[PDB]
Every structure is written in structure tokens, then in C-alpha cells.
Amino acid sequence: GAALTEKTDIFESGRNGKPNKDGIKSYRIPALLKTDKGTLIAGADERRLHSSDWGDIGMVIRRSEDNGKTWGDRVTITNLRDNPKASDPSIGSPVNIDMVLVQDPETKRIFSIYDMFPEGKGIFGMSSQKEEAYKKIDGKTYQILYREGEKGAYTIRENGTVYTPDGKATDYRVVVDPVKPAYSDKGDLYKGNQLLGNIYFTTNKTSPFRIAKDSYLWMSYSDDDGKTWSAPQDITPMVKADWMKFLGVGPGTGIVLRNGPHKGRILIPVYTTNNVSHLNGSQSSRIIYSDDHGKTWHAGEAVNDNRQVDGQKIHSSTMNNRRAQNTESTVVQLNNGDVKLFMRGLTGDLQVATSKDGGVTWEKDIKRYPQVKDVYVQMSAIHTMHEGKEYIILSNAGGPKRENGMVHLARVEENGELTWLKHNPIQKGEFAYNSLQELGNGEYGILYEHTEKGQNAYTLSFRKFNWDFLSK
Amino acid sequence: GAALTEKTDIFESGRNGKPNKDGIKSYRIPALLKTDKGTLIAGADERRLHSSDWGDIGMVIRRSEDNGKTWGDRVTITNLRDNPKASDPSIGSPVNIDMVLVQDPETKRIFSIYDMFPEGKGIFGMSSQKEEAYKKIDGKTYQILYREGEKGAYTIRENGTVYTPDGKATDYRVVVDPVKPAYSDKGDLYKGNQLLGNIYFTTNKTSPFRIAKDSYLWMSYSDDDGKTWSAPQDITPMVKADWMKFLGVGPGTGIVLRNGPHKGRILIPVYTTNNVSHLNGSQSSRIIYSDDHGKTWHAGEAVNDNRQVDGQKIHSSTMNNRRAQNTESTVVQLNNGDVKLFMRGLTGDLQVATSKDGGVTWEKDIKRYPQVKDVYVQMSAIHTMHEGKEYIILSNAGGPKRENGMVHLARVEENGELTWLKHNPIQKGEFAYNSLQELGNGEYGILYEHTEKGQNAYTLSFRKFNWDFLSK
Numbered sequence: 001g002a003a004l005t006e007k008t009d010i011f012e013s014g015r016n017g018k019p020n021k022d023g024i025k026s027y028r029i030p031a032l033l034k035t036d037k038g039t040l041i042a043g044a045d046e047r048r049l050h051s052s053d054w055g056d057i058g059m060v061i062r063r064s065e066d067n068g069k070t071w072g073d074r075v076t077i078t079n080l081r082d083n084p085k086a087s088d089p090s091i092g093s094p095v096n097i098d099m100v101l102v103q104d105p106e107t108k109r110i111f112s113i114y115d116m117f118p119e120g121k122g123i124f125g126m127s128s129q130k131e132e133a134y135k136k137i138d139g140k141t142y143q144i145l146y147r148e149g150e151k152g153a154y155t156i157r158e159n160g161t162v163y164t165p166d167g168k169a170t171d172y173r174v175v176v177d178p179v180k181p182a183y184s185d186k187g188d189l190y191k192g193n194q195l196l197g198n199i200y201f202t203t204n205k206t207s208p209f210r211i212a213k214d215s216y217l218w219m220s221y222s223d224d225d226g227k228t229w230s231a232p233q234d235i236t237p238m239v240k241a242d243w244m245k246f247l248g249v250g251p252g253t254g255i256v257l258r259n260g261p262h263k264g265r266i267l268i269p270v271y272t273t274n275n276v277s278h279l280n281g282s283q284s285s286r287i288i289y290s291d292d293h294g295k296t297w298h299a300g301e302a303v304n305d306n307r308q309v310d311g312q313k314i315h316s317s318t319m320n321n322r323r324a325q326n327t328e329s330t331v332v333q334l335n336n337g338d339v340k341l342f343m344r345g346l347t348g349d350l351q352v353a354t355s356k357d358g359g360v361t362w363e364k365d366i367k368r369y370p371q372v373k374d375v376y377v378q379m380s381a382i383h384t385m386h387e388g389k390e391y392i393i394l395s396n397a398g399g400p401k402r403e404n405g406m407v408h409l410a411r412v413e414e415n416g417e418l419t420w421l422k423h424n425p426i427q428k429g430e431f432a433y434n435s436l437q438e439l440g441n442g443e444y445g446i447l448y449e450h451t452e453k454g455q456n457a458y459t460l461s462f463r464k465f466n467w468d469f470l471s472k
Numbered sequence: 473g474a475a476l477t478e479k480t481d482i483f484e485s486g487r488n489g490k491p492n493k494d495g496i497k498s499y500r501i502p503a504l505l506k507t508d509k510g511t512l513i514a515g516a517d518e519r520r521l522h523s524s525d526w527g528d529i530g531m532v533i534r535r536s537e538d539n540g541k542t543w544g545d546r547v548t549i550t551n552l553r554d555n556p557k558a559s560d561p562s563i564g565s566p567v568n569i570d571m572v573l574v575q576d577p578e579t580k581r582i583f584s585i586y587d588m589f590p591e592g593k594g595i596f597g598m599s600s601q602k603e604e605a606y607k608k609i610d611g612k613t614y615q616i617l618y619r620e621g622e623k624g625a626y627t628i629r630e631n632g633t634v635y636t637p638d639g640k641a642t643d644y645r646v647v648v649d650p651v652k653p654a655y656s657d658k659g660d661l662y663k664g665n666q667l668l669g670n671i672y673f674t675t676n677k678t679s680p681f682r683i684a685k686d687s688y689l690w691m692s693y694s695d696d697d698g699k700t701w702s703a704p705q706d707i708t709p710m711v712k713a714d715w716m717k718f719l720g721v722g723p724g725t726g727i728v729l730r731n732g733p734h735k736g737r738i739l740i741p742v743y744t745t746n747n748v749s750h751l752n753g754s755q756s757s758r759i760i761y762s763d764d765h766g767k768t769w770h771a772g773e774a775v776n777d778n779r780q781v782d783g784q785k786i787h788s789s790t791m792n793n794r795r796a797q798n799t800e801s802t803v804v805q806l807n808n809g810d811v812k813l814f815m816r817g818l819t820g821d822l823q824v825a826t827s828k829d830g831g832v833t834w835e836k837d838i839k840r841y842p843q844v845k846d847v848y849v850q851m852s853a854i855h856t857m858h859e860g861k862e863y864i865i866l867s868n869a870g871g872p873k874r875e876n877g878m879v880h881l882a883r884v885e886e887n888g889e890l891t892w893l894k895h896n897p898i899q900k901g902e903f904a905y906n907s908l909q910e911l912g913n914g915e916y917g918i919l920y921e922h923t924e925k926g927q928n929a930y931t932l933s934f935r936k937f938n939w940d941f942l943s944k
């Protein structure tokens with residue numbers, strides 16, 4: 001008997017192009033996480049001014065201590081302050097966008113990894129020319145600041161003190177230890193005790209310094225079941241290669257590997273572009289990972305690294321092949337130790353990559369499943385055991401557009417092949433991003449993007465699952 | 473008063489398309505070095521089968537213990553063995569091409585740094601897709617091998633033993649410590665005691681393994697005034713970034729900095745291309761350098777890194793601007809500590825970059841001197857003192873084509889500005905690459921490319937001249 005709850009709204013978009021009660025026009029990019037304590041953390045983009053992938057965006061969560069009925073109030077993880085002098089407020093703020101949640105099972109620490117850009121249009125406003133973002137000086141890596149009319153790289157060193165290109169301390173300093181709510185002060189630029197501006201501002205600046213215009217990866221963590229969160233840490237220099245243009249998360253929920261020689265590794269879906277073809281032919285999925293409980297991070301190789309396409313090998317740093325792209329992804333570990341990566345792409349059906357070494361490298365062939373539609377939108381997938389049998393549940397739009405959210409059920413064969421045991425609809429109308437979690441006791445939950453009644457894209461809602469609804 | 477000696481031919485090409493008496497069709501790419509012992513070392517590419525920038529090419533030198541009057545026998549530094557199964561022998565050999573010579577004045581070690589490519593057409597045969605060439609495994613960097621029909625990266629580890637992608641030793645091993653004359657055995661691929669093939673072969677292979685198809689940088693060294701040479705060392709992983717396509721030397725003779733805080737630093741001119749525009753818009757000069765007497769090498773930044781061209785900043789890794797290219801270069805240190813980089817380019821006149829920090833970074837604006845033409849060909853320049861005043865001597869083709877060799881004398885003014893005083897012909901007819909050295913007692917030597925009497929491109933000849941010839 002399909003025991004599906006009714007659409008329960010977690011983040012409420014405005015209506016008919018108008019702000020909602022709190023002044024927030026739009027919400028997007030769901031992430032759903034069940035912690036050890038049992039609580040559910042629903043995370044999202046709080047897009048205050050419009051639905052687009054830039055602007056004034058906060059990383060926020062709400063928690064439910066009762067498995068999905070009472071969702072508490074908003075906790076803001078990060079929300080950088082807007083440029084008060086921007087001529088166009090809609091592109092007038094440093095950007096945070098797209099989250100992945102995961103928890104370490106030993107330390108219980110919870111992680112939010114999300115994109116950051118300086119002021120502008122984010123992934124759609126990236127420059128054609130590289131600016132160096134970091135400099136290693138006597139074994140230490142520092143973030144670079146550029147000053148108008150000077151070519152050299154200033155650096156942000158100890159306690160935020162700004163140093164000249166030649167290595168001499170100055171009177172300028174950056175707030176590297178933010179203290180205000182939502183860490184709205186991160187990046188503020190002081191001269192002495194006087195606030196001048198912010199290193200993330202790119203127009204009508206009131207201070208002399210800015211970071212490189214580039215794509216960055218930030219992380220925040222909570223040690224009290226997601227009630228309070230650390231200041232953001234810039235993990236970009238640990239994982240971003242010198243050729244990468246864009247580097248960002250596949251939004252959703254990561255995993256911790258539960259078996260095999262790499263047990264305890266945290267996996268975070270990400271994807272890159274290169275400077276050869278950027279968003280037109282190089283978007284490429286991979287993971288980043290931590291083996292030390294989130295203290296340090298490393299990049300896996302891309303699925304597209306040394307992949308054969310139409311008889312010729314490509315590489316994510318050099319490819320120019322619109323159809324060979326794979327972008328946002330969701331990652332699952334099997335019981336045979338294998339890692340499966342389900343990747344948004346442009347074949348029309350579901351693409352899946354397999355790694356035998358814990359997500360670092362990927363096997364030759366991308367498996368395509370026409371049994372599952374992919375209309376080129378984010379998806380989520382989780383592992384679950386039922387009656388001693390191993391399964392995967394994957395949720396995404398059924399089509400033809402971002403509409404008709406379906407839930408697809410597969411049995412995991414011994415050798416890791418997937419057998420799709422039919423697909424049951426879960427939401428009609430508009431259906432876009434989504435995030436699944438196993439709730440335990442034969443149950444499943446989902447936080448997803450959906451609109452009706454002229455709601456602004458999107459309102460994020462929660463439904464519930466029973467094992468019987470999945471099958472038949 | 474003015475004295476120019478007569479053309480003494482050091483490396484003699486064949487005539488009318490035919491091999492010379494030794495079976496060599498072509499010589500190219502002079503480097504000239506006066507050692508501490510007084511010896512002159514003349515280096516060149518020995519291009520057996522033809523004049524093009526690929527094929528069977530050896531790195532060779534001759535030595536003159538009498539200031540350029542008589543010359544000893546050819547000494548071969550490196551000459552990789554041909555692929556005996558190649559269909560076209562003219563592109564059928566692993567390639568060494570273009571050397572920079574320099575001597576460490578403290579240790580007396582003499583270095584030859586030169587390009588390397590696997591079998592093919594060198595810089596003109598580079599693939600559009602990147603193949604990873606190196607893998608770091610628990611802090612140790614190993615060269616990658618690719619195996620027929622398999623995607624993963626093997627590694628060449630201790631004693632040349634080949635390891636599987638999964639990390640298990642195999643019965644295959646690479647000759648990493650070559651022993652034959654000219655180190656023709658380097659890269660040989662053995663299984664057990666049976667020679668199967670060579671990892672630098674790329675066609676009609678008899679072994680299963682090859683290195684990444686890419687551009688490499690190698691170094692060989694002599695401790696006995698150039699009579700004997702170490703086995704080649706692969707210095708690529710020390711200096712080549714992950715975005716770089718081509719990375720190679722600007723051939724000629726490097727320098728050791730004689731004053732300032734980086735005295736003793738070895739500088740080697742090099743240039744790169746990127747994957748965005750490669751040879752059509754991205755050639756970019758820089759130096760590599762050693763602070764530990766040649767044991768380890770580092771890349772400086774490109775002249776074109778964060779350069780403004782028509783109001784827009786570029787980077788060597790993303791540029792696509794034919795006119796902003798700078799390629800092969802020759803490097804000089806002034807008495808005020810500054811480094812000057814004279815760069816082959818496409819403005820028609822001489823382009824000069826300046827570094828204040830020992831070659832690591834370059835000042836904003838590239839100086840052009842219309843008094844010295846540049847017809848897009850290599851050049852050489854050296855520092856020199858005369859009767860207490862500071863000069864630079866620079867030699868290149870006078871034009872309109874690669875013809876009419878000139879020597880240009882410039883006075884180094886107070887501030888490091890250059891004043892071009894004289895321009896004197898040194899060789900009528902064809903004239904291309906060249907390499908200058910001070911011989912002492914007010915005299916100078918030059919090794920250069922020229923043809924006459926139906927000689928194949930080129931014969932490398934040597935003249936000596938004196939201050940009156942220069943200053944006239």
C-alpha cells in the first residue's frame with residue numbers, strides 16, 4: 001500500500017514574481033541529510049532577488065527532529081554581504097551557490113560544501129583569461145589580491161595581514177575570521193581599524209583590493225547536529241588544478257564509504273570546465289574526497305580523463321565534445337566495494353560511471369540506461385538494503401521537460417550491474433532538483449524542487465516513502 | 473683596427489639535398505659556451521635525415537681548447553635510437569631538439585638542457601588531447617606508462633620496474649639508467665631479460681607500453697669540461713604545469729646571475745603554448761631556474777602572465793593573441809641586478825622584458841626598440857664590460873628575411889635603459905640562429921647558422937671579432 005505523504009513545503013518561494021513573507025523571491029538546490037541523532041537537515045539556496053544562478057544567495061538549512069513533520073526555523077550557514085555600491089543589485093553580490101551535505105560517521109561532524117564566486121554572475125560570468133588566485137611562498141599558500149593599476153600579486157597572510165608583491169607587510173588586513181551572523185563580514189578590507197570595502201567586490205569598489213575573478217569551493221561544518229556552523233574554509237587550493245576554469249559541486253548529498261580498503265572516505269560530487277570549450281564542451285564529473293575526516297581534500301580523476309569517445313581519447317582539461325559531457329552527479333557505493341556515479345548529461349537517458357578504487361579513477365565505459373530518462377537536470381540516488389537484497393533508488397524528472405518526478409528502482413547484481421525494476425511517479429507538474437535519504441525502518445524521504453499556483457521557481461517540498469510504494 | 477676572423481665551419485651540413493661525408497644531412501641550433509678552463513663548447517642539433525624539427529636528431533658538441541682555431545671530435549650527449557619498425561624513418565624516431573648550455577661557476581658543472589618528444593613530428597605533431605605523463609604516489613613522482621587496450625596508468629618506479637595501475641610490481645622494466653654510447657638504450661622496454669621495444673616508440677610497437685604523448689624537458693651534465701656527459705635527467709615534472717602544452721628551451725646559452733640577492737641562480741630561457749591556441753596565439757617566454765647548482769629546477773612566471781593587451785589582462789595559459797606572443801629568448805643580467813629577456817616575436821622589432829626579482833616575475837610593460845629589427849627568428853645577447861662601461865651585444869638576422877647577420881651594440885644606461893650605438897654586419901647571405909660568447913681580452917666569439925655553395929640548412933660556423941669591429 002503506497003504510503004506517500006502529501007507535499008510538505010520546507011522553503012517557500014514567493015508568488016507571481018514577488019517576494020515571499022521574508023522578502024525571499026526564490027529557493028533552489030535541495031540537499032537532505034539524516035544525521036546520527038536521527039534529525040533531518042534540509043539545505044537550500046536562499047535566492048533573495050530572483051531565481052537565477054547568481055546574486056544575493058545564502059546557504060541555509062532547516063531541521064526536523066521528528067523525521068519530517070516539524071521543520072524548525074532557518075539556520076543561515078553563510079551569506080556574504082552585498083556590494084552596497086553595485087549599480088545592478090541583481091548581480092551585485094559575492095555569490096555562494098549549490099550545496100552538498102554529508103556527515104562523518106566517526107566524529108559526527110557535518111559538512112556543507114558549496115560554490116563561491118566574487119561579485120557578478122557566477123558560472124555565467126567567468127572571464128576568458130585566467131587570473132592566478134593563490135601563491136606559495138616558502139611552503140605556505142596564500143590567497144592573492146590584485147590592486148588596480150598594479151600587475152603584482154599581493155598576498156593575504158597571517159591574521160589577514162596584506163603583504164605587497166615584494167613581501168613587505170602593509171597596514172591593510174582582511175577579515176579572515178568572520179564574527180557577524182552568517183559571516184557576512186568575511187572578506188572585509190580594513191586599513192588599520194577602518195573598514196574600506198570587501199575583497200569580494202568587483203565593481204564601484206571602495207577599497208583597493210580584490211581576489212582573482214575565478215571559481216572557488218568553500219566548506220562549513222557543524223558539530224552540534226547542524227544548529228551552529230563554522231566560518232567558511234576555502235578548500236579550493238587543495239583540489240583545483242591550474243587548468244580548471246569552473247570547479248563546483250554536484251548539489252545534493254555526499255556519502256561516506258562504508259566498506260572496502262577505503263572505508264571512511266568522504267565523497268563529494270563535483271564537475272569542472274576547461275578553458276578550451278568551457279560550458280559548451282568540457283563539463284566533466286568527478287569526485288573530491290577526504291580520508292582524514294574532512295580535514296584535507298583531494299581531487300579524484302575525471303570520468304572523462306583518458307576516456308575513449310568515437311575512437312579517440314579525450315581528457316577533461318582539453319575536451320571539446322558537447323555530447324561527451326557529464327556534469328552534476330550523485331554517488332553511491334555498492335557492497336562489492338564499487339562506487340557508482342550517476343551523471344547529468346545530454347544523451348537523453350541515464351549515464352553511470354564505475355570506480356573500483358574508491359572514486360579516484362573510473363572504468364573505461366559509461367553505461368547508458370534507456371529505462372531511465374535524463375532530461376538534463378540534477379538527480380539523486382542512494383543505497384539501501386531490503387530483505388537481505390541490495391538496491392538503489394534514484395529520483396529525477398520523468399520528462400519530457402523538468403516535470404513528472406519519478407522514482408526509479410534498481411536491483412544491484414553481484415557484479416555491480418543494474419537491473420531496473422520499474423518506475424513509479426511521485427510528483428506531477430514541474431520537478432527539477434531532488435535529494436533522497438533513507439529514513440530507516442523500510443522508509444525513504446525526499447526534498448525536491450516544485451512549483452504550482454504561480455509559485456516562483458522553486459518551492460522546496462518533502463514527501464515520504466515506503467518500501468511498497470517503490471515496487472509495483 | 474677592426475678584426476673579424478674568417479668563417480670556420482664547425483658542423484658541416486651536406487650539399488644539394490645530400491648527406492655529408494658522415495652521413496648527416498643537416499645541422500641546426502647553435503649554442504656556444506666558454507668554460508672556466510678557457511674551452512669553447514659548440515653545441516648543435518645533428519639532424520641526420522633532413523632539416524625539419526623532428527626525426528633522428530642527436531645532441532652533440534665539439535670542443536676547442538685554442539679559442540676557436542682547431543676543434544676536437546664530435547661528442548654525442550644524447551641520441552635516442554630510432555624506431556626500427558617505423559614506416560617513415562623521417563618521422564620515425566624519438567626526438568631531442570634545441571639545447572641551452574650553461575656552466576655553474578662554483579661547481580664547474582656544465583649543463584645541456586634540451587627538448588624531448590616521443591616518436592613523431594615534435595612540436596608540429598602534438599595531440600589535441602592531454603595525456604597525464606606523471607603520477608605522484610605517496611610523495612614520489614613516477615613517469616606514467618600506457619598499455620595497449622587498457623585505460624589505467626602504469627608507473628615506472630625504482631630500478632625501472634613497471635607497476636600496474638593497482639600498484640603491483642610486474643616482470644617488465646624500463647632502462648632508466650642507460651649505458652650504451654649516446655644513451656641510445658634509454659627507454660628500452662624489457663620483460664625479464666628479453667628486449668621487447670621502447671617506451672618512446674609510438675607506431676608499429678613491439679612492446680605493450682609507451683609514455684604520454686607530450687612535450688618533455690631533459691638535462692644532461694658534464695663535470696670534465698664537456699668530454700663526457702651524464703645520462704639524461706627528465707626535469708619536466710619540476711617545471712611543467714598541468715595546463716602547459718608545449719614547454720621547451722629558447723636555445724642558446726643561459727647565464728648564472730653574478731650579483732644581487734640571487735647571485736648563483738642559473739637561468740634557462742624557455743617558452744610554452746597552451747591548449748587554447750597552441751602555436752597560433754599562445755607562445756610565451758619565461759625562464760626556469762635553479763638555486764641549488766642544477767639539482768632542482770623551478771619555473772618563473774611568463775612575461776605574458778597578467779599582462780595588459782589593449783586594456784585586457786591575459787595569461788600565458790589562456791591567451792589567444794598572435795601579436796602578444798613571445799617565444800625563444802636570450803637572457804641578460806645587468807650590473808644593477810635587473811634581468812633582461814630579449815624575445816623572438818612578431819612586431820618586426822626587438823622586444824625586451826625586465827625582471828627585478830631574478831627572473832621570477834616581469835614588469836608591466838614590454839619595451840620595443842625599432843632600432844633593432846626582428847624578423848621572427850632566434851637571437852642571442854650577452855653582457856660585457858669595456859673600459860669601465862657596461863654594454864650588451866646582441867646578434868640576429870638583419871633582414872628582410874633570415875639573412876644578413878648583424879651584431880648590435882648597446883650601452884646600458886644608468887637606469888637600466890638601453891641605447892643602441894652600433895649595428896655591424898657579420899655575415900652576408902643566409903643567417904638564422906646564433907650564440908655569442910665573450911672570449912676575454914676584449915674579444916668575442918659567435919656560432920651561427922648560414923648556408924652557401926648549395927649547403928643544406930644549415931652549416932654552423934664560428935667567427936671571432938674584437939671591440940673595434942663592434943664599436944666602429
Ligand SMILES: CCOCCn1cc(CSC[C@@H](O)[C@@H](O)[C@@H]2O[C@H](C(=O)O)C[C@H](O)[C@H]2NC(C)=O)nn1
Nearest residue numbers: 029053097098115122123124248279280327328377
Ligand atoms: C545552444 C548553445 O550550446 C551550448 C549549450 N549550453 C549548455 C549550457 C550549460 S549548464 C551548467 C549548469 O549545470 C549550472 O548552471 C547549474 O544550472 C542549474 C539548472 O537549473 O540547470 C542550476 C544550478 O544552480 C547551476 N549551478 C551553477 C554553479 O550555476 N549552456 N549552454
Ligand SMILES: CCOCCn1cc(CSC[C@@H](O)[C@@H](O)[C@@H]2O[C@H](C(=O)O)C[C@H](O)[C@H]2NC(C)=O)nn1
Nearest residue numbers: 501525569570587594595596720751752799800849
Ligand atoms: C603564414 C604561415 O602561418 C603559420 C604561422 N605559424 C608559425 C608557427 C610557429 S613556431 C615554433 C618554432 O619556434 C619551433 O619550431 C622552432 O623553430 C625553428 C625555426 O627555424 O623557426 C627551429 C627550432 O628547432 C624549432 N624548435 C622546435 C622545438 O620545433 N605557427 N603558426
Ligand SMILES: [Ca+2]
Nearest residue numbers: 056080082093
Ligand atoms: Ca549576499
Ligand SMILES: [Ca+2]
Nearest residue numbers: 528529552565
Ligand atoms: Ca635517433
Ligand SMILES: [Cl-]
Nearest residue numbers: 197198206207
Ligand atoms: Cl571594495
Ligand SMILES: [Cl-]
Nearest residue numbers: 544545546547
Ligand atoms: Cl668526429
Ligand SMILES: [Cl-]
Nearest residue numbers: 669670678679
Ligand atoms: Cl615498442
Ligand SMILES: [Cl-]
Nearest residue numbers: 730731732735
Ligand atoms: Cl653582490
